[PDB]
Amino acid sequence: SQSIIAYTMSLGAENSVAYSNNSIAIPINFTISVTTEILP
Amino acid sequence: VSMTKTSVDCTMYICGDSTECSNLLLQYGSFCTQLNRALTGIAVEQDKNTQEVFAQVKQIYKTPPIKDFGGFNFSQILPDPSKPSKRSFIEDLLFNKVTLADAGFIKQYLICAQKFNGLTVLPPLLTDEMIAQYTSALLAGTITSGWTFGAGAALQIPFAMQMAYRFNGIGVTQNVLYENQKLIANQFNSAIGKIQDSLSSTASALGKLQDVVNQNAQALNTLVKQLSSNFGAISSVLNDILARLDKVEAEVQIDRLITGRLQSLQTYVTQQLIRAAEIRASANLAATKMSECVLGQSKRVDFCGKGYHLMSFPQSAPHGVVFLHVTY
Amino acid sequence: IANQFNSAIGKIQDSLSSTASALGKLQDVVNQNAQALNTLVKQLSSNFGAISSVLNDILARLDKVEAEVQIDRLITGRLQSLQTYVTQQLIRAAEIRASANLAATKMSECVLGQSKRVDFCGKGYHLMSFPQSAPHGVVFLHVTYVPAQEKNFTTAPAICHDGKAHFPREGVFVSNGTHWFVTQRNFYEPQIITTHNTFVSGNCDVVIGIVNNTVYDPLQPELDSFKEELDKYFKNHTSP
Amino acid sequence: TTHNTFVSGNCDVVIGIVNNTVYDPLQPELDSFKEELDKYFKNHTSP
Ligand SMILES: *[C@@H]1O[C@H](CO)[C@@H](O[C@@H]2O[C@H](CO)[C@@H](O[C@H]3O[C@H](CO)[C@@H](O)[C@H](O)[C@@H]3O)[C@H](O)[C@H]2NC(C)=O)[C@H](O)[C@H]1NC(C)=O
Ligand SMILES: *[C@@H]1O[C@H](CO)[C@@H](O[C@@H]2O[C@H](CO)[C@@H](O[C@H]3O[C@H](CO)[C@@H](O)[C@H](O)[C@@H]3O)[C@H](O)[C@H]2NC(C)=O)[C@H](O)[C@H]1NC(C)=O
Ligand SMILES: *[C@@H]1O[C@H](CO[C@@H]2O[C@@H](C)[C@@H](O)[C@@H](O)[C@@H]2O)[C@@H](O[C@@H]2O[C@H](CO)[C@@H](O)[C@H](O)[C@H]2NC(C)=O)[C@H](O)[C@H]1NC(C)=O
Ligand SMILES: *[C@@H]1O[C@H](CO)[C@@H](O[C@@H]2O[C@H](CO)[C@@H](O)[C@H](O)[C@H]2NC(C)=O)[C@H](O)[C@H]1NC(C)=O
Ligand SMILES: *[C@@H]1O[C@H](CO)[C@@H](O[C@@H]2O[C@H](CO)[C@@H](O)[C@H](O)[C@H]2NC(C)=O)[C@H](O)[C@H]1NC(C)=O
Ligand SMILES: *[C@@H]1O[C@H](CO)[C@@H](O)[C@H](O)[C@H]1NC(C)=O
Ligand SMILES: *[C@@H]1O[C@H](CO)[C@@H](O)[C@H](O)[C@H]1NC(C)=O
Ligand SMILES: *[C@@H]1O[C@H](CO)[C@@H](O)[C@H](O)[C@H]1NC(C)=O
């Protein structure tokens, strides 16, 4: 039931950020994350 | 950030529609496979360069409908919804100023098609509308969220409080923003005015992108003109040899043209490989400027414009990026 | 924080085990050098318009006077196959040097230091990085603080208390909607607004969007509690 | 003020140091806290 499909690519998920002249977002918690990077 | 993706077929160029010349070309082994591969590696790398510069944000951030950025007027650098391509006002100045060079290259060499010399211009993976939409997301992230969307999720902060976070970064106390906020916003608005006015008035300023278009145009002029060179054969026109002579007297003439043409491609591909390395160096610098001047504030002196760095705004240009650096 | 670092290193083992794609940037360099050598060796099979590509068969089947004309072809085509290969290798070596100079720069700035460069030492705010070697390359395990669970808050650029305006020394003013606090820039940890957390400049008028709130003075209860001990001494001294 | 500054050593070591007063904001508070006190004492000399 699989097939080859062609499409206009999405650039990423949409997000309208909740900006206002008097409102801020501050993180209550954080993730330590370890990301590999590989260089020749 | 990139250059026009040009793929030449080495068989079409050397031996265009002659099976006789194609049978002789096979005696040289892999050189045409190797030359088509070399040019294809350059063409793939133009998308890599463009993706590394612009696709640094994984969400498409929208700008709010309520434009209360504390008196700062980003209208010239945010998208105009009313245009067909959703570019900023300043991005259209950049687009017209370089497309007046691109349109020459496109007609000399937008469903592009192969010319009889074997030259082909391929499309980029990202349309100018997709680069505008990535650039919009970077700018809308910057003005709504400051540097925080570089590190985590986008966290909203009021724009005058973001500029205070930035003033502390250059070692100026944040009250020096708020006690002067109308003056700082008026100088920012007046300076974005001078960018717009300059880009409309100037002859020379986009020379750094004109140069990339002009080098690729001139290297294709040179490569196509070498099809007229006899290389000591009775003619530089391949059918005019096969019409006049026989199956043995022709081959000595065809092999001259194969030798000289193949050398003309080997030359062009070397200039293009060395060029692609210079455009990749420029794209890696542009990706570093996008990461360090747009997604953050840089303490690297003169890396983000002549001044103390506050913030930077990316704008698309044909084959390039423009950063409007904002400095105290 | 230790358990998150220990867990994240556990995902590095799983990733580097699970997919062949992981080291693609190194395997691409081995593959291009192998391709360039394999192509260079295949050009020895090419005729270049000699009667054979085998140089010893040309030499066996022809006398000196004719053999030079065949071997001239083979020399010209093979010499161009070396000049092609060596040009690709000189250009390749420049891409590998640019990569090595970048890796040396990441070794210096991400391992031997901590970098303010955004997205240079991995994505997030850089804590530290660990080098690991690979075939013809280097792997950096970049450790980053990523802010993860936000709340929205009401905020103000300044506070008015005694007609003088106050600004955070460090961090930002935030409210839960009933009380005002000052907190650090990248982690919600609220504190009572005091004359130690804040600095003063100018009157209440010039700062757009300023809010009225008390600023607590931590010396005031010391002089008030020292005033009540003084008032007990005066009242006691009414009694003798 | 004593808040805008910090102390280390004595005048002889720093090339090109200058004499000036350094103000203390705890001081005029403590003096207002003396004038509040002395008037008390003086009133309680009266009865
Ligand atoms: C905004 O943050 C404030 C500080 O955390 C918080 O105020 C505090 O609220 C708690 C109750 O949730 C109070 O706790 C006391 O409640 C009564 C007071 O009579 C006593 O019976 C309890 O035993 C207990 O002592 C705190 O006293 C109070 N602090 C202050 C300084 O008032 C607000 O509730 C938060 N508001 C929102 C909307 O989140
Ligand atoms: C923040 O706190 C301030 C101090 O409590 C407060 O200022 C006070 O505002 C009122 C209204 O503007 C003034 O009332 C006077 O208004 C006019 C004269 O200007 C007269 O019609 C009135 O009878 C009355 O005299 C107060 O004089 C003024 N106090 C001071 C010291 O200037 C702010 O309004 C507060 N702001 C917020 C947003 O909370
Ligand atoms: C922080 O608040 C914003 C906006 O305020 C809230 O909006 C309503 C949803 C309601 O709860 C009000 O009483 C609040 O004051 C939040 O923005 C909304 O987010 C939801 C998704 O969660 C989205 O569907 C809505 O479109 C947004 N509102 C608007 C006006 O567009 C925001 O999510 C809050 N932030 C966090 C981290 O919870
Ligand atoms: C902050 O995030 C951590 C995870 O990174 C949370 O820790 C988990 O907490 C739940 C209970 O709420 C436990 O079941 C898990 O075992 C915990 N994991 C670890 C690794 O400790 C933590 O609770 C979060 N704290 C806040 C205040 O949100
Ligand atoms: C942001 O700046 C633009 C100008 O660059 C402002 O647009 C002008 O507004 C006035 C008053 O309506 C008009 O007379 C001009 O003709 C407009 N020019 C253009 C190019 O549109 C815009 O109003 C400003 N926005 C804010 C919030 O002040
Ligand atoms: C009053 O002062 C006397 C000493 O002069 C002391 O013994 C007494 O305990 C004091 N009482 C109080 C309540 O201060
Ligand atoms: C500055 O220079 C003058 C000589 O021109 C000298 O007398 C003076 O002491 C110098 N000041 C300091 C702090 O060394
Ligand atoms: C002294 O203080 C008392 C109250 O304790 C008051 O009645 C009296 O008038 C004061 N007299 C003077 C001269 O201060």
Residue numbers in the entry:
A (entry chain C): 689 to 728
B (entry chain A): 729 to 837, 849 to 1067
C (entry chain C): 923 to 1162
D (entry chain A): 1116 to 1162
Authors' own words:
SARS-CoV-2 is an enveloped positive-stranded RNA virus that depends on fusion of viral and target cell membranes to enter a host cell. This first key step of infection is catalyzed by the virus-encoded trimeric spike (S) protein, which is also a major surface antigen and thus an important target for development of diagnostics, vaccines, and therapeutics. The RBD can adopt two distinct conformations: “up” for a receptor-accessible state and “down” for a receptor-inaccessible state. We have previously identified two structural elements, the FPPR (fusion peptide proximal region) and the 630 loop, which appear to modulate the S protein stability as well as the RBD conformation and thus the receptor accessibility. In this study, we have characterized the full-length S proteins from the B.1.1.7 and B.1.351 variants and determined their structures by cryo–electron microscopy (cryo-EM), providing a structural basis for understanding the molecular mechanisms of the enhanced infectivity of B.1.1.7 and the immune evasion of B.1.351.
3D classification identified five distinct classes for the B.1.1.7 S trimer—representing one closed prefusion conformation, three one-RBD-up conformations, and one two-RBD-up conformation—and two different classes for the B.1.351 trimer, representing a closed conformation and a one-RBD-up conformation. For the B.1.1.7 S trimer, most particles used for refinement were in the RBD-up conformation. In the one-RBD-up conformation, one 630 loop on the opposite side of the up RBD becomes fully structured, inserting between neighboring NTD and CTDs in the same configuration found in the G614 trimer. The second 630 loop is partially ordered, whereas the third one remains disordered. A similar pattern is found for three FPPRs, although the structured FPPR adopts a conformation distinct from the one seen in our previous structures of the full-length S proteins. Overall, the arrangement of these structural elements appears to stabilize the cleaved S trimer and to prevent the premature S1 dissociation in the one-RBD-up conformation. Moreover, in the one-RBD-up conformation of the B.1.1.7 S, in which the FPPR is at least partially structured, Lys854, which in the G614 trimer probably forms a hydrogen bond with the main chain carbonyl group of Gly614, flips back in B.1.1.7 to form a salt bridge with the mutant Asp570. In the one-RBD-up conformation, the NTD and CTDs on the opposite side of the up RBD move closer together, narrowing the gap between them and stabilizing the structured 630 loop. Once one RBD flips up, the fully or partially ordered 630 loops of the neighboring protomers stabilize the CTD2, which folds together with the N-terminal segment of S2, and thus prevent the premature S1 dissociation. The B.1.1.7 virus is the most sensitive to the trimeric ACE2 and the RBD-up–targeting C63C7, suggesting that the B.1.1.7 trimer may prefer the RBD-up conformation.
